[PDB]
Amino acid sequence: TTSSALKGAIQLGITHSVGSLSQKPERDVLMQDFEVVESIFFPSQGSSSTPGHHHGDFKFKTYAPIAFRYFREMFGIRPDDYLYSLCNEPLIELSNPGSLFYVSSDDEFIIKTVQHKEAEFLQTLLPGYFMNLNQNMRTLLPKFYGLYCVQADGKNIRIVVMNNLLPRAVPMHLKFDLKGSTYKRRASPKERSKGVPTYKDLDFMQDMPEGILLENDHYTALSRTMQRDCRVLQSFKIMDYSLLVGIHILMGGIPAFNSKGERLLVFIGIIDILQSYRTVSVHRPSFYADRFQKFMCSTVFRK
Amino acid sequence: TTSSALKGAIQLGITHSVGSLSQKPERDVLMQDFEVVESIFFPSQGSSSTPGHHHGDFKFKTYAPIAFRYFREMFGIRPDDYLYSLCNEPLIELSNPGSLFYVSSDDEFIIKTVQHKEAEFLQTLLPGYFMNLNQNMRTLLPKFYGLYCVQADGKNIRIVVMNNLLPRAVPMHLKFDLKGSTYKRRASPKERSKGVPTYKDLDFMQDMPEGILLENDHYTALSRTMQRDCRVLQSFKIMDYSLLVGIHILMGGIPAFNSKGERLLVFIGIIDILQSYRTVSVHRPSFYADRFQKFMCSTVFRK
């Protein structure tokens, strides 16, 4: 039960870590806060912790606690809802190729697994992530809610908690994953035997040759924050990220769009961020991010 | 003419540096931006610059240009007004013991001189200063508008541009400079032969034994952002700063206050910041900042 052992510790780990944060009074974030790493150990019969069929014996670390309560707050995630969704309702597994990929019962939170490299990375990129939120409210970047580590019998599973663009609340008729490149960028046979498959660039150019149409006001805004997100991402030497796009042929938090003659609710966000600088040229990530926006404006079309 | 040589270069230096920034389109700040140092050289007869009786021959460096346009913007300093006030109206000198202390004609900007140490410092503390603005709008900290350096015949005069709490627009009947300490913290004989002298702690405790009274709403707010500013300052290992307080016995941007029976417009802000970590204990700055607020609540009184 590699999984059930993890599944429980994560729920038990967060209840404590975040629960006990909520007794302390809130106070602004300082630079020092991004580097903190608070831990706590979870024995079977520890008074101040709890025992468990899950909690056989382990330690639970949470990175940058105070930054993440900020980030949650700024995302509008009331902590009661956070730790209800995660720790109180049986979260559910999901195949997606040692790394796991869990999801909340309410399907508003993804819990991914991440390698030591990709995790320490994220950690270093918190201050830019902060500088981003506070300057670009409509940022299509991933919404990171938390970063933790379940150290288990001499092995560390580190995990990231984040939003889940396309939640299941509103149905998705179409899903595209887009990089602005082309090579082997079709869907696998397996993938198109799904119900609402996630197509890719080449698929999009033959299946949606007419673009996805937007009114000048909505397009302007989108162009604007693509450009901005791309400038950030570029700054961090990041690449191989894609624009996940949920089409809904109609809390409609989407944009006003049109097919080749019909009303739409698109739903989009940038994904697969944590990958940068470990042999690409010094001007590669720039090229990648130009290609990106320039292409997302044969994807999202105007007038 | 050590001074007139500086006075002109500063005006000529900023016009160019900031003027030419305004042709480029605005774009968000990134962490990389805090470390940039842009320069430009000012010969007598340089086409793309200008000549000058002031500009005999010098180089002009501006630190973190893009962060400072952000900070200006956030302070509501329209750049046309910035470089009119500074570069277009004859700024005026001021004794205040090689360091000079200029002021704008309109008296809305102080131009101080700073040593290599205190300047590089400020530079390192920009990201926290950013994290502060964006989290505490009513921050009693200094408003840094710009940081530059006039390299002159093989010597660097570095200078800081900032707000000027008590401007002369509204008259100041009383001025206090307060640290929450006491030792040799009286006014010099010279100082009290001024018109509107800047008294200090001991003076304040005998001259204002009745506090400075505030209504629960206004006091709450003040307490709150003292506490917060002090937490920031503490974080940066900073001390020997004071609360400059302008009393006006009545664009009234002050707070509602009362004397021992009369209406008031107080005007306050934290000053003398750039001094930290260069032999004080690891918990000294904390002690300094506790003393501070705890004392500023025998200075600013409630109910």
Numbering used by the authors:
A (entry chain A), B (entry chain A): 57 to 153, 157 to 309, 357 to 384, 402 to 426
Paper text:
The reaction catalysed by the type I PIPK, or phosphatidylinositol 4-phosphate 5-kinase (PIP5K1), is the major synthetic route for PtdIns4,5P2 in most cells. To help elucidating the mechanism for PIP5K1 regulation by DVL, we determine the X-ray structure of the kinase domain of zebrafish PIP5K1A. In this work, we present the first crystal structure of a PIP5K1 molecule. More importantly, the new crystal structure enables us to delineate two adjacent interfaces for dimerization and interaction with DVL that are unique to the PIP5K1 kinases and unravel the importance of these interfaces in regulation of the kinase enzymatic activity by dimerization and interaction with DVL.
The locations of Lys-171 (from the conserved ‘IIK' motif), Asp-299 (MDYSL) and Asp-378 (IID) in the three-dimensional structure of PIP5K1A suggest that they are functionally equivalent to Lys-72, Asp-166 and Asp-184 of PKA, which participate in ATP binding and catalysis. In PIP5K1A, the turn between β8 and α4c is compact. The side chain of Arg-244 is potentially hydrogen bonded to the main chain carbonyl oxygen and side chain carboxylate group of Asp-236, and pushes the side chain of Lys-238 into the active site. Size-exclusion chromatography/multi-angle laser light scattering (SEC/MALLS) indicates that the kinase has a molecular weight of 90 kDa, suggesting that the protein is dimeric in the solution. The crystal structure reveals that the dimer has a side-to-side arrangement, involving both N- and C-lobes of the kinase. Most residues constituting the dimeric interface are found within three structural elements: the loop between α1 and α1a, α4b, and α6. α4b is near the centre of the dimer, and interacts with its symmetric mate (α4b*) through hydrophobic contacts mediated by Pro-186, Phe-189 and Met-190. The negatively charged Asp-84* from the α1*–α1a* loop is matched against a positively charged patch (Arg-287) on α6, while Leu-86* forms hydrophobic contact with Val-291. Unfortunately, the specificity loop (zPIP5K1A residues 386–401), in which the primary determinant of substrate specificity lies28, is disordered in the PIP5K1A structure as in the PIP4K2B structure (Rao et al.), and therefore it remains difficult to rationalize the preferences of PIPKs towards different lipid substrates.
